[PDB]
């Protein structure tokens with residue numbers, strides 16, 4: 015069902031996606047433990063993910079959420095990092111993509127910081143790093159992130175000192191760091207139909223000079 019369309023680096027669409035990747039790197043309080051040490055990426059490819067069935071599933075749910083929230087989907091573009099990126103683009107988000115041990119409950123997590131999503135590319139806490147070199151900071155192996163369209167509807171705001179169901183009458187959770195003033199928010203959804211994996215970004219983290 016899914017096809018992947020390569021975007022040309024000359025297309026404005028590739029350019030705005032790359033910009034959202036690069037401009038939302040930040041430093042991490044683990045010193046690079048999970049995701050590696052870097053200030054920027056080498057973007058290698060950006061693909062558009064196309065799946066008629068998955069799209070209609072997303073927009074069906076989006077209209078429902080919109081209806082329960084003063085006609086407002088509260089739709090965002092947010093990063094998602096996971097070892098299951100290949101299953102998500104073909105079969106969609108579902109409960110196996112949920113993070114049972116997560117702070118904001120057992121749901122599917124997205125990040126405004128591309129570098130926060132990068133910490134999950136090889137597993138929770140970076141797992142054991144890349145498959146080939148077991149290196150969480152690997153500068154050689156190609157990584158992949160999704161940049162997804164996410165319906166948040168009415169989002170329960172949970173301040174943070176950094177499959178379950180949304181709090182009653184909410185459609186998602188906003189996990190908002192309240193200590194690190196430069197950390198952007200994370201969002202958790204509890205229905206896989208509330209995210210559509212729009213872009214597939216292949217990249218390397220770059221060793222700082």
Ligand SMILES: Cc1cc(O)nc2ccccc12
Nearest residue numbers: 093094095113123124131134
């Ligand atoms: C916080 C977070 C961001 C992300 O992009 N992926 C995750 C995948 C699993 C668990 C958490 C995650």
Ligand SMILES: [Zn+2]
Nearest residue numbers: 144147152155
């Ligand atoms: Zn490697």
